[PDB]
Motif scaffolding. Structure first.
Motif, mmCIF file in Angstrom:
data_model
loop_
_atom_site.group_PDB
_atom_site.id
_atom_site.type_symbol
_atom_site.label_atom_id
_atom_site.label_comp_id
_atom_site.label_asym_id
_atom_site.label_seq_id
_atom_site.Cartn_x
_atom_site.Cartn_y
_atom_site.Cartn_z
ATOM 1 N N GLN A 221 0.809 -1.212 0.000
ATOM 2 C CA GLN A 221 0.000 0.000 0.000
ATOM 3 C C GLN A 221 0.844 1.265 0.000
ATOM 4 O OE1 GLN A 221 -3.210 -0.626 -0.967
ATOM 5 N NE2 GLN A 221 -4.254 0.063 0.897
ATOM 6 N N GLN B 179 0.895 3.187 -3.257
ATOM 7 C CA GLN B 179 -0.249 4.021 -3.609
ATOM 8 C C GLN B 179 0.109 5.500 -3.646
ATOM 9 O OE1 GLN B 179 -3.646 3.324 -4.117
ATOM 10 N NE2 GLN B 179 -3.857 1.160 -3.564
ATOM 11 N N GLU C 12 0.864 7.023 -7.331
ATOM 12 C CA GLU C 12 -0.274 7.255 -8.211
ATOM 13 C C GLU C 12 -1.319 8.175 -7.598
ATOM 14 O OE1 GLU C 12 -1.425 3.258 -8.921
ATOM 15 O OE2 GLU C 12 -2.684 3.093 -7.131
ATOM 16 N N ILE C 13 -1.268 8.410 -6.286
ATOM 17 C CA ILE C 13 -2.169 9.387 -5.684
ATOM 18 C C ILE C 13 -1.783 10.796 -6.111
ATOM 19 C CG2 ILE C 13 -2.607 10.532 -3.477
ATOM 20 C CD1 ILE C 13 -2.959 7.686 -2.279
#
Lengths: 31, 31
Positions: B21, B24, B27-28
């Motif tokens: 995680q 993430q 790409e956030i």
């Protein structure tokens, strides 16, 4: 006590979360 | 107790799930 309460895990979990948060530096400066 | 109940596994499994995680973040920000 550290293992029973999950303190060691939270000790470990919050460790490399900062390492993952260390990659925020690249997109903070270059964006 | 940790091994009998699978606590150690869930302790380990939920560990690098956060590491996965952690990706993430890229790409956030860039999407």
């Amino acid at each position: 006590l550290e293992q029973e309460s999950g303190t060691k895990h939270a000790r470990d979990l919050e460790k490399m979360k900062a390492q993952s948060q260390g990659n925020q530096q690249l997109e903070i400066t270059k964006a």
